[PDB]
PDB file of C-alpha atoms in Angstrom:
ATOM      1  CA  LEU A1306      27.266  -4.055  11.347  1.00 48.47           C
ATOM      2  CA  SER A1307      27.619  -7.511   9.795  1.00 50.21           C
ATOM      3  CA  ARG A1308      24.246  -8.144   8.126  1.00 53.24           C
ATOM      4  CA  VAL A1309      23.662  -4.598   6.850  1.00 52.08           C
ATOM      5  CA  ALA A1310      25.863  -4.866   3.751  1.00 52.37           C
ATOM      6  CA  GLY A1311      24.311  -8.188   2.750  1.00 55.93           C
ATOM      7  CA  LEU A1312      20.802  -6.819   3.218  1.00 56.09           C
ATOM      8  CA  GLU A1313      21.689  -3.854   0.999  1.00 54.99           C
ATOM      9  CA  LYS A1314      23.023  -6.232  -1.662  1.00 53.50           C
ATOM     10  CA  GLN A1315      19.773  -8.209  -1.575  1.00 55.10           C
ATOM     11  CA  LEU A1316      18.071  -4.834  -1.998  1.00 54.92           C
ATOM     12  CA  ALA A1317      20.110  -3.991  -5.102  1.00 52.23           C
ATOM     13  CA  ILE A1318      19.329  -7.395  -6.602  1.00 52.24           C
ATOM     14  CA  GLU A1319      15.575  -7.330  -5.939  1.00 52.33           C
ATOM     15  CA  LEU A1320      15.443  -3.740  -7.177  1.00 53.44           C
ATOM     16  CA  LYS A1321      17.062  -4.816 -10.436  1.00 54.93           C
ATOM     17  CA  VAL A1322      14.489  -7.613 -10.667  1.00 55.42           C
ATOM     18  CA  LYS A1323      11.718  -5.070 -10.059  1.00 52.24           C
ATOM     19  CA  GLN A1324      13.024  -2.836 -12.848  1.00 54.48           C
ATOM     20  CA  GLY A1325      13.085  -5.804 -15.203  1.00 54.42           C
ATOM     21  CA  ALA A1326       9.530  -6.799 -14.308  1.00 53.99           C
ATOM     22  CA  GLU A1327       8.296  -3.238 -14.842  1.00 55.48           C
ATOM     23  CA  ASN A1328       9.873  -3.177 -18.296  1.00 56.57           C
ATOM     24  CA  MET A1329       8.269  -6.525 -19.131  1.00 54.54           C
ATOM     25  CA  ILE A1330       4.843  -5.251 -18.077  1.00 54.97           C
ATOM     26  CA  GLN A1331       5.437  -2.174 -20.227  1.00 55.45           C
ATOM     27  CA  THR A1332       6.394  -4.312 -23.235  1.00 55.71           C
ATOM     28  CA  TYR A1333       3.451  -6.730 -23.039  1.00 55.95           C
ATOM     29  CA  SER A1334       0.791  -4.088 -22.359  1.00 54.16           C
ATOM     30  CA  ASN A1335       0.108  -3.905 -26.102  1.00 55.32           C
ATOM     31  CA  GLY A1336      -2.964  -5.966 -25.230  1.00 57.92           C
ATOM     32  CA  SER A1337      -2.495  -8.919 -27.575  1.00 60.98           C
ATOM     33  CA  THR A1338      -4.242 -12.146 -26.572  1.00 61.56           C
ATOM     34  CA  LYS A1339      -0.901 -13.917 -27.038  1.00 63.95           C
ATOM     35  CA  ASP A1340       1.129 -11.870 -24.533  1.00 63.59           C
ATOM     36  CA  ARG A1341      -1.553 -12.198 -21.846  1.00 63.24           C
ATOM     37  CA  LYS A1342       0.208 -14.905 -19.821  1.00 63.39           C
ATOM     38  CA  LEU A1343       3.588 -13.183 -20.137  1.00 60.16           C
ATOM     39  CA  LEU A1344       1.987  -9.956 -18.910  1.00 59.80           C
ATOM     40  CA  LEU A1345       0.328 -11.634 -15.923  1.00 60.80           C
ATOM     41  CA  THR A1346       3.600 -13.350 -15.043  1.00 63.99           C
ATOM     42  CA  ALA A1347       5.439 -10.031 -15.262  1.00 60.52           C
ATOM     43  CA  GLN A1348       2.861  -8.512 -12.897  1.00 62.49           C
ATOM     44  CA  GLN A1349       3.100 -11.304 -10.321  1.00 62.77           C
ATOM     45  CA  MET A1350       6.877 -10.935 -10.487  1.00 63.03           C
ATOM     46  CA  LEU A1351       6.720  -7.175  -9.942  1.00 60.64           C
ATOM     47  CA  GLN A1352       4.492  -7.659  -6.905  1.00 61.32           C
ATOM     48  CA  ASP A1353       6.788 -10.402  -5.599  1.00 61.56           C
ATOM     49  CA  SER A1354       9.876  -8.197  -5.839  1.00 62.08           C
ATOM     50  CA  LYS A1355       8.097  -5.290  -4.133  1.00 61.18           C
ATOM     51  CA  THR A1356       6.915  -7.474  -1.238  1.00 61.83           C
ATOM     52  CA  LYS A1357      10.402  -8.967  -0.832  1.00 61.48           C
ATOM     53  CA  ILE A1358      11.783  -5.431  -0.723  1.00 61.04           C
ATOM     54  CA  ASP A1359       9.274  -4.556   2.009  1.00 63.25           C
ATOM     55  CA  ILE A1360      10.277  -7.593   4.108  1.00 64.80           C
ATOM     56  CA  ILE A1361      14.030  -7.305   3.598  1.00 67.41           C
ATOM     57  CA  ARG A1362      13.627  -3.630   4.534  1.00 66.99           C
ATOM     58  CA  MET A1363      11.846  -4.490   7.786  1.00 61.77           C
ATOM     59  CA  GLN A1364      14.802  -6.740   8.570  1.00 61.74           C
ATOM     60  CA  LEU A1365      17.190  -3.945   7.558  1.00 63.51           C
ATOM     61  CA  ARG A1366      15.528  -1.396   9.830  1.00 64.54           C
ATOM     62  CA  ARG A1367      15.941  -3.988  12.581  1.00 65.10           C
ATOM     63  CA  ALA A1368      19.647  -4.352  11.752  1.00 65.24           C
ATOM     64  CA  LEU A1369      20.171  -0.586  12.041  1.00 63.50           C
ATOM     65  CA  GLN A1370      19.311  -0.653  15.741  1.00 67.07           C
ATOM     66  CA  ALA A1371      22.488  -1.113  17.788  1.00 66.37           C
TER      67      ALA A1371
ATOM     68  CA  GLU B1403     -33.707  -8.716   0.747  1.00 65.41           C
ATOM     69  CA  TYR B1404     -30.172  -9.133   2.109  1.00 64.92           C
ATOM     70  CA  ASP B1405     -30.363 -12.926   2.248  1.00 66.47           C
ATOM     71  CA  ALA B1406     -32.181 -12.915  -1.093  1.00 66.23           C
ATOM     72  CA  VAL B1407     -29.474 -10.746  -2.656  1.00 70.03           C
ATOM     73  CA  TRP B1408     -26.778 -13.020  -1.232  1.00 71.30           C
ATOM     74  CA  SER B1409     -28.590 -16.173  -2.365  1.00 68.90           C
ATOM     75  CA  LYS B1410     -28.931 -14.737  -5.865  1.00 69.03           C
ATOM     76  CA  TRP B1411     -25.243 -13.806  -5.773  1.00 70.67           C
ATOM     77  CA  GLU B1412     -24.378 -17.377  -4.803  1.00 68.77           C
ATOM     78  CA  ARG B1413     -26.481 -18.993  -7.533  1.00 67.48           C
ATOM     79  CA  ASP B1414     -24.761 -16.576  -9.913  1.00 71.89           C
ATOM     80  CA  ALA B1415     -21.364 -18.001  -8.988  1.00 74.98           C
ATOM     81  CA  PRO B1416     -19.209 -18.614 -12.088  1.00 75.51           C
ATOM     82  CA  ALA B1417     -17.927 -22.155 -12.674  1.00 77.38           C
ATOM     83  CA  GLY B1418     -15.800 -23.404  -9.781  1.00 79.26           C
ATOM     84  CA  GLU B1419     -16.590 -20.365  -7.653  1.00 79.89           C
ATOM     85  CA  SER B1420     -19.584 -21.899  -5.852  1.00 82.99           C
ATOM     86  CA  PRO B1421     -17.991 -23.226  -2.624  1.00 82.60           C
ATOM     87  CA  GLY B1422     -16.144 -19.952  -2.042  1.00 83.53           C
ATOM     88  CA  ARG B1423     -19.292 -17.881  -2.493  1.00 83.50           C
ATOM     89  CA  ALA B1424     -21.183 -20.245  -0.175  1.00 85.47           C
ATOM     90  CA  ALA B1425     -18.517 -19.757   2.489  1.00 85.61           C
ATOM     91  CA  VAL B1426     -18.667 -15.982   2.069  1.00 84.08           C
ATOM     92  CA  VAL B1427     -22.456 -16.133   2.377  1.00 82.78           C
ATOM     93  CA  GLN B1428     -22.048 -18.068   5.627  1.00 78.74           C
ATOM     94  CA  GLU B1429     -19.749 -15.316   6.892  1.00 80.52           C
ATOM     95  CA  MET B1430     -22.209 -12.586   5.924  1.00 80.16           C
ATOM     96  CA  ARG B1431     -25.190 -14.336   7.506  1.00 80.55           C
ATOM     97  CA  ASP B1432     -23.049 -14.679  10.625  1.00 82.82           C
ATOM     98  CA  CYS B1433     -22.437 -10.928  10.623  1.00 79.09           C
ATOM     99  CA  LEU B1434     -26.141 -10.266  10.070  1.00 78.00           C
ATOM    100  CA  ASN B1435     -27.809 -12.677  12.498  1.00 79.64           C
ATOM    101  CA  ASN B1436     -25.106 -12.910  15.171  1.00 78.22           C
ATOM    102  CA  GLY B1437     -23.959  -9.288  14.922  1.00 78.75           C
ATOM    103  CA  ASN B1438     -20.387 -10.119  13.939  1.00 79.08           C
ATOM    104  CA  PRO B1439     -18.626  -6.759  13.357  1.00 78.40           C
ATOM    105  CA  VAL B1440     -15.927  -8.256  11.117  1.00 76.40           C
ATOM    106  CA  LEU B1441     -16.458  -9.685   7.627  1.00 75.75           C
ATOM    107  CA  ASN B1442     -13.560 -11.691   6.196  1.00 75.28           C
ATOM    108  CA  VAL B1443     -14.226 -13.223   2.783  1.00 77.57           C
ATOM    109  CA  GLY B1444     -10.938 -15.128   2.664  1.00 75.48           C
ATOM    110  CA  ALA B1445      -9.458 -16.045  -0.687  1.00 74.61           C
ATOM    111  CA  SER B1446     -12.275 -17.815  -2.502  1.00 76.44           C
ATOM    112  CA  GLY B1447     -11.082 -16.933  -5.989  1.00 77.15           C
ATOM    113  CA  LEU B1448     -13.986 -14.486  -5.985  1.00 77.23           C
ATOM    114  CA  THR B1449     -14.605 -12.656  -9.253  1.00 71.51           C
ATOM    115  CA  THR B1450     -17.362 -10.553  -7.669  1.00 73.82           C
ATOM    116  CA  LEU B1451     -18.939  -9.477  -4.380  1.00 75.65           C
ATOM    117  CA  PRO B1452     -22.675  -9.056  -3.647  1.00 77.27           C
ATOM    118  CA  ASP B1453     -24.336  -5.729  -4.505  1.00 72.95           C
ATOM    119  CA  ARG B1454     -24.678  -5.016  -0.788  1.00 75.65           C
ATOM    120  CA  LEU B1455     -22.663  -6.031   2.289  1.00 76.95           C
ATOM    121  CA  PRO B1456     -23.972  -6.495   5.855  1.00 76.36           C
ATOM    122  CA  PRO B1457     -24.884  -2.995   7.136  1.00 76.23           C
ATOM    123  CA  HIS B1458     -23.507  -3.194  10.676  1.00 74.41           C
ATOM    124  CA  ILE B1459     -19.972  -4.522  10.090  1.00 75.92           C
ATOM    125  CA  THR B1460     -17.162  -2.278  11.357  1.00 74.21           C
ATOM    126  CA  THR B1461     -14.272  -4.079   9.624  1.00 74.32           C
ATOM    127  CA  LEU B1462     -13.965  -5.636   6.152  1.00 70.13           C
ATOM    128  CA  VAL B1463     -11.134  -7.938   5.057  1.00 70.15           C
ATOM    129  CA  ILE B1464     -10.672  -8.932   1.417  1.00 68.86           C
ATOM    130  CA  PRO B1465      -7.664 -11.236   0.733  1.00 69.89           C
ATOM    131  CA  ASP B1466      -6.301 -12.354  -2.642  1.00 70.01           C
ATOM    132  CA  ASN B1467      -9.120 -12.655  -5.176  1.00 70.41           C
ATOM    133  CA  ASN B1468     -10.200 -11.877  -8.744  1.00 73.52           C
ATOM    134  CA  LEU B1469     -12.319  -8.804  -7.896  1.00 76.51           C
ATOM    135  CA  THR B1470     -12.483  -6.096 -10.565  1.00 77.17           C
ATOM    136  CA  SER B1471     -14.355  -3.736  -8.224  1.00 77.86           C
ATOM    137  CA  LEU B1472     -15.862  -3.368  -4.760  1.00 79.08           C
ATOM    138  CA  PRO B1473     -19.525  -2.811  -3.840  1.00 77.72           C
ATOM    139  CA  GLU B1474     -20.639   0.353  -2.064  1.00 77.87           C
ATOM    140  CA  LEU B1475     -19.451   0.116   1.533  1.00 80.69           C
ATOM    141  CA  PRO B1476     -21.501   0.400   4.768  1.00 82.29           C
ATOM    142  CA  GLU B1477     -21.559   3.864   6.354  1.00 81.20           C
ATOM    143  CA  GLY B1478     -20.334   2.510   9.686  1.00 82.42           C
ATOM    144  CA  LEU B1479     -17.237   0.791   8.341  1.00 80.36           C
ATOM    145  CA  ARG B1480     -14.173   1.665  10.431  1.00 79.40           C
ATOM    146  CA  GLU B1481     -11.502  -0.502   8.787  1.00 78.90           C
ATOM    147  CA  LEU B1482     -11.023  -1.756   5.228  1.00 81.96           C
ATOM    148  CA  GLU B1483      -8.269  -4.108   4.071  1.00 78.09           C
ATOM    149  CA  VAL B1484      -8.071  -5.017   0.373  1.00 78.53           C
ATOM    150  CA  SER B1485      -5.108  -7.033  -0.861  1.00 75.03           C
ATOM    151  CA  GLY B1486      -3.917  -9.337  -3.623  1.00 77.29           C
ATOM    152  CA  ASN B1487      -6.334  -8.353  -6.371  1.00 81.21           C
ATOM    153  CA  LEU B1488      -4.307  -7.640  -9.505  1.00 82.82           C
ATOM    154  CA  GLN B1489      -7.290  -6.621 -11.614  1.00 81.49           C
ATOM    155  CA  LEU B1490      -8.655  -4.146  -9.068  1.00 80.63           C
ATOM    156  CA  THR B1491      -7.616  -0.679 -10.223  1.00 82.75           C
ATOM    157  CA  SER B1492     -10.182   1.398  -8.335  1.00 83.58           C
ATOM    158  CA  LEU B1493     -11.767   1.813  -4.898  1.00 84.14           C
ATOM    159  CA  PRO B1494     -15.442   2.750  -4.389  1.00 83.48           C
ATOM    160  CA  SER B1495     -16.308   6.007  -2.624  1.00 80.67           C
ATOM    161  CA  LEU B1496     -15.082   5.606   0.955  1.00 81.46           C
ATOM    162  CA  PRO B1497     -17.386   6.028   3.987  1.00 84.37           C
ATOM    163  CA  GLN B1498     -16.644   9.288   5.823  1.00 85.52           C
ATOM    164  CA  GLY B1499     -16.237   7.530   9.170  1.00 85.68           C
ATOM    165  CA  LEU B1500     -13.473   5.294   7.823  1.00 83.89           C
ATOM    166  CA  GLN B1501     -10.360   5.123  10.015  1.00 81.11           C
ATOM    167  CA  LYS B1502      -7.983   2.470   8.654  1.00 80.37           C
ATOM    168  CA  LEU B1503      -7.511   1.979   4.922  1.00 81.32           C
ATOM    169  CA  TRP B1504      -5.080  -0.768   3.982  1.00 79.78           C
ATOM    170  CA  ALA B1505      -5.260  -1.402   0.257  1.00 80.25           C
ATOM    171  CA  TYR B1506      -2.130  -2.933  -1.181  1.00 80.69           C
ATOM    172  CA  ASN B1507      -0.716  -5.449  -3.630  1.00 81.06           C
ATOM    173  CA  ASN B1508      -3.474  -4.467  -6.016  1.00 78.81           C
ATOM    174  CA  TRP B1509      -3.513  -2.615  -9.349  1.00 76.81           C
ATOM    175  CA  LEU B1510      -4.946   0.694  -8.100  1.00 77.00           C
ATOM    176  CA  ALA B1511      -4.299   3.591 -10.492  1.00 78.93           C
ATOM    177  CA  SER B1512      -5.742   6.213  -8.165  1.00 74.08           C
ATOM    178  CA  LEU B1513      -7.470   6.764  -4.851  1.00 72.65           C
ATOM    179  CA  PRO B1514     -10.888   8.328  -4.318  1.00 72.93           C
ATOM    180  CA  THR B1515     -10.955  11.428  -2.122  1.00 74.14           C
ATOM    181  CA  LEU B1516     -10.031  10.229   1.355  1.00 72.11           C
ATOM    182  CA  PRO B1517     -12.307  10.493   4.429  1.00 76.02           C
ATOM    183  CA  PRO B1518     -11.217  13.173   6.965  1.00 75.45           C
ATOM    184  CA  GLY B1519     -11.163  10.807   9.934  1.00 70.69           C
ATOM    185  CA  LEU B1520      -8.711   8.422   8.311  1.00 73.19           C
ATOM    186  CA  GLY B1521      -5.722   7.988  10.605  1.00 77.01           C
ATOM    187  CA  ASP B1522      -4.004   5.072   8.896  1.00 79.85           C
ATOM    188  CA  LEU B1523      -3.391   4.800   5.166  1.00 74.42           C
ATOM    189  CA  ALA B1524      -1.328   2.044   3.615  1.00 76.07           C
ATOM    190  CA  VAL B1525      -1.419   1.784  -0.158  1.00 75.02           C
ATOM    191  CA  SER B1526       1.668  -0.015  -1.405  1.00 75.14           C
ATOM    192  CA  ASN B1527       2.706  -2.052  -4.408  1.00 73.22           C
ATOM    193  CA  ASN B1528      -0.005  -0.373  -6.462  1.00 73.25           C
ATOM    194  CA  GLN B1529       0.127   1.525  -9.758  1.00 75.26           C
ATOM    195  CA  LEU B1530      -0.509   4.948  -8.185  1.00 71.51           C
ATOM    196  CA  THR B1531       1.175   7.843  -9.976  1.00 71.27           C
ATOM    197  CA  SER B1532      -0.425  10.410  -7.643  1.00 72.61           C
ATOM    198  CA  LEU B1533      -2.159  10.938  -4.314  1.00 72.04           C
ATOM    199  CA  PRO B1534      -5.126  13.107  -3.328  1.00 72.68           C
ATOM    200  CA  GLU B1535      -4.995  15.616  -0.478  1.00 74.74           C
ATOM    201  CA  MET B1536      -4.173  13.987   2.860  1.00 74.68           C
ATOM    202  CA  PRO B1537      -6.715  13.813   5.706  1.00 75.12           C
ATOM    203  CA  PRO B1538      -5.544  16.080   8.576  1.00 72.27           C
ATOM    204  CA  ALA B1539      -5.917  13.292  11.135  1.00 70.01           C
ATOM    205  CA  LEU B1540      -3.657  10.802   9.348  1.00 68.35           C
ATOM    206  CA  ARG B1541      -0.855   9.557  11.608  1.00 68.62           C
ATOM    207  CA  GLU B1542       0.551   6.783   9.389  1.00 67.71           C
ATOM    208  CA  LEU B1543       1.186   6.836   5.652  1.00 67.74           C
ATOM    209  CA  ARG B1544       2.711   3.999   3.627  1.00 65.18           C
ATOM    210  CA  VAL B1545       2.855   4.802  -0.099  1.00 61.47           C
ATOM    211  CA  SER B1546       5.920   2.706  -0.959  1.00 63.22           C
ATOM    212  CA  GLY B1547       6.208   0.482  -4.023  1.00 62.54           C
ATOM    213  CA  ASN B1548       4.420   2.848  -6.389  1.00 62.97           C
ATOM    214  CA  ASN B1549       5.065   5.136  -9.351  1.00 58.55           C
ATOM    215  CA  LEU B1550       4.791   8.296  -7.235  1.00 59.14           C
ATOM    216  CA  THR B1551       6.926  11.184  -8.466  1.00 60.72           C
ATOM    217  CA  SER B1552       5.930  13.363  -5.511  1.00 58.49           C
ATOM    218  CA  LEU B1553       3.828  13.703  -2.362  1.00 63.87           C
ATOM    219  CA  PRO B1554       1.091  16.194  -1.440  1.00 61.86           C
ATOM    220  CA  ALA B1555       1.105  18.353   1.700  1.00 62.99           C
ATOM    221  CA  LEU B1556       1.609  16.232   4.826  1.00 60.72           C
ATOM    222  CA  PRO B1557      -0.657  16.505   7.923  1.00 58.91           C
ATOM    223  CA  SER B1558       0.607  17.858  11.259  1.00 56.02           C
ATOM    224  CA  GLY B1559      -0.120  14.590  13.046  1.00 54.01           C
ATOM    225  CA  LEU B1560       1.729  12.159  10.799  1.00 51.97           C
ATOM    226  CA  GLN B1561       3.930   9.868  12.888  1.00 51.92           C
ATOM    227  CA  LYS B1562       5.221   7.674  10.047  1.00 50.87           C
ATOM    228  CA  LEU B1563       5.892   7.977   6.324  1.00 48.36           C
ATOM    229  CA  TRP B1564       7.118   5.274   3.948  1.00 46.89           C
ATOM    230  CA  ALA B1565       7.640   6.655   0.440  1.00 47.36           C
ATOM    231  CA  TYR B1566      10.410   4.229  -0.496  1.00 49.56           C
ATOM    232  CA  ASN B1567      10.808   2.577  -3.898  1.00 44.38           C
ATOM    233  CA  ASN B1568       9.222   5.329  -5.997  1.00 45.97           C
ATOM    234  CA  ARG B1569      10.071   8.006  -8.572  1.00 45.10           C
ATOM    235  CA  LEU B1570      10.100  10.841  -6.027  1.00 43.36           C
ATOM    236  CA  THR B1571      12.101  13.890  -7.103  1.00 43.81           C
ATOM    237  CA  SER B1572      11.224  16.037  -4.083  1.00 45.74           C
ATOM    238  CA  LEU B1573       9.788  15.674  -0.580  1.00 46.84           C
ATOM    239  CA  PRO B1574       7.260  18.143   0.847  1.00 45.02           C
ATOM    240  CA  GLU B1575       7.662  20.023   4.130  1.00 45.00           C
ATOM    241  CA  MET B1576       7.415  17.894   7.268  1.00 44.36           C
ATOM    242  CA  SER B1577       5.841  18.355  10.692  1.00 42.49           C
ATOM    243  CA  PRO B1578       8.208  18.180  13.705  1.00 43.21           C
ATOM    244  CA  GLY B1579       6.158  15.358  15.219  1.00 41.66           C
ATOM    245  CA  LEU B1580       7.273  12.840  12.597  1.00 41.51           C
ATOM    246  CA  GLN B1581       8.795   9.768  14.264  1.00 40.53           C
ATOM    247  CA  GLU B1582       9.870   7.705  11.248  1.00 39.81           C
ATOM    248  CA  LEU B1583      10.598   8.644   7.643  1.00 41.05           C
ATOM    249  CA  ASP B1584      11.710   6.053   5.116  1.00 41.61           C
ATOM    250  CA  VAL B1585      12.326   7.361   1.619  1.00 43.39           C
ATOM    251  CA  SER B1586      14.578   5.026  -0.301  1.00 39.74           C
ATOM    252  CA  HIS B1587      15.400   4.226  -3.884  1.00 34.21           C
ATOM    253  CA  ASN B1588      14.054   7.530  -5.177  1.00 32.57           C
ATOM    254  CA  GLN B1589      15.248  10.417  -7.350  1.00 31.16           C
ATOM    255  CA  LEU B1590      15.664  13.018  -4.598  1.00 27.74           C
ATOM    256  CA  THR B1591      18.714  15.209  -5.161  1.00 26.85           C
ATOM    257  CA  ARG B1592      17.610  17.589  -2.399  1.00 26.54           C
ATOM    258  CA  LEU B1593      15.823  17.688   0.963  1.00 23.35           C
ATOM    259  CA  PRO B1594      13.415  20.110   2.716  1.00 23.62           C
ATOM    260  CA  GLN B1595      14.748  22.418   5.442  1.00 24.32           C
ATOM    261  CA  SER B1596      11.984  21.236   7.779  1.00 27.31           C
ATOM    262  CA  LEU B1597      14.061  18.085   8.212  1.00 28.95           C
ATOM    263  CA  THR B1598      16.109  20.010  10.787  1.00 28.99           C
ATOM    264  CA  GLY B1599      13.032  20.540  12.951  1.00 31.15           C
ATOM    265  CA  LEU B1600      12.655  16.822  13.627  1.00 27.38           C
ATOM    266  CA  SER B1601      13.201  15.101  16.966  1.00 26.82           C
ATOM    267  CA  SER B1602      16.597  13.494  17.585  1.00 32.49           C
ATOM    268  CA  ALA B1603      14.668  10.274  18.222  1.00 33.82           C
ATOM    269  CA  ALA B1604      13.412  10.283  14.628  1.00 34.96           C
ATOM    270  CA  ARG B1605      14.498   7.451  12.330  1.00 31.73           C
ATOM    271  CA  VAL B1606      15.207   8.645   8.785  1.00 29.93           C
ATOM    272  CA  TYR B1607      16.372   6.391   5.954  1.00 28.55           C
ATOM    273  CA  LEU B1608      17.597   8.255   2.862  1.00 24.46           C
ATOM    274  CA  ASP B1609      19.579   5.404   1.297  1.00 20.57           C
ATOM    275  CA  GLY B1610      19.104   4.770  -2.423  1.00 18.66           C
ATOM    276  CA  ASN B1611      19.001   8.407  -3.520  1.00 23.09           C
ATOM    277  CA  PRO B1612      21.291  10.574  -5.692  1.00 19.31           C
ATOM    278  CA  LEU B1613      21.348  13.344  -3.085  1.00 14.83           C
ATOM    279  CA  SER B1614      24.417  15.535  -3.600  1.00 13.76           C
ATOM    280  CA  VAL B1615      27.711  16.673  -2.085  1.00 13.16           C
ATOM    281  CA  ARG B1616      26.063  19.840  -0.792  1.00 12.12           C
ATOM    282  CA  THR B1617      23.184  17.774   0.585  1.00 10.99           C
ATOM    283  CA  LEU B1618      25.539  15.139   2.009  1.00  7.66           C
ATOM    284  CA  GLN B1619      27.704  17.617   3.913  1.00  7.77           C
ATOM    285  CA  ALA B1620      24.516  19.395   4.964  1.00  4.23           C
ATOM    286  CA  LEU B1621      23.352  16.066   6.397  1.00  3.54           C
ATOM    287  CA  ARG B1622      26.685  15.512   8.152  1.00  2.55           C
ATOM    288  CA  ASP B1623      26.588  18.982   9.714  1.00  2.00           C
ATOM    289  CA  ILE B1624      22.969  18.410  10.754  1.00  4.09           C
ATOM    290  CA  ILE B1625      23.973  15.107  12.363  1.00  4.52           C
ATOM    291  CA  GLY B1626      26.851  16.800  14.161  1.00  6.59           C
ATOM    292  CA  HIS B1627      24.618  19.525  15.588  1.00  5.11           C
ATOM    293  CA  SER B1628      21.599  17.300  16.303  1.00  6.75           C
ATOM    294  CA  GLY B1629      22.452  13.677  17.056  1.00  4.48           C
ATOM    295  CA  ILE B1630      19.543  12.288  15.050  1.00  5.37           C
ATOM    296  CA  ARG B1631      20.110   9.093  13.051  1.00  5.66           C
ATOM    297  CA  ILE B1632      20.194   9.381   9.250  1.00  7.32           C
ATOM    298  CA  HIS B1633      21.163   7.085   6.346  1.00  6.41           C
ATOM    299  CA  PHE B1634      23.495   7.858   3.422  1.00  8.72           C
ATOM    300  CA  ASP B1635      23.676   5.983   0.114  1.00  7.65           C
TER     301      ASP B1635
END
């Protein structure tokens, strides 16, 4: 199928992004008042990537019907 | 009492949070006086909810907010949806008669023991590293987007399972009545024998896992003998 490969690539990318975000969150969890904003940003990014994975995966499950 | 508690809660609004709380209060008074079964607080930027919700509401919807915690829930609550609260790491004890629990895109570290009647559980994009025992009546389970390294025993009535995007090393045994299983981007190098007992109409996505040559050829043989659709990656 045409779109499958592309969807999987998007998956690899967003997964990499998710990994990165997780590592950021882990690094800034020291709890310093200075890293607060960086930590929150890292969180929002993690959540974003996960949601995108959910959506792209819905689309992918659709693409696997043929 | 109720209206007094809600009024107090409104006057106690933090700076900038007044209009939102007033709206929520309108909603709650609607539920109370007009018997509206559903309470939707919307996204008000709420940092807190009143000590007590309307008693007779069946369904509760909490969108993106600042909530650190939830108040004790009404005994007759059938459905609960909590989403978009990054500082909410914990749910309150859940009413036994609860059917649908959708709590996702939050910070939850753990879940409280789940009510037996629960048939639909979606907790995704949370911090969960573990799950409690599963209610026997649960037909739909979405745990994806978590830290889970494993799943507990699955109920005989489960029609759907999404474990994808986790740390899972191993899947548990599965009931033949499972329609859809998506486990992706996990650590599984192996799969449970019960997988063979599934219906040929089952949709199983294994992509994103190490698996193994033995497991891969096992899957190919199983496909040859069955005709069920499976994913390899």
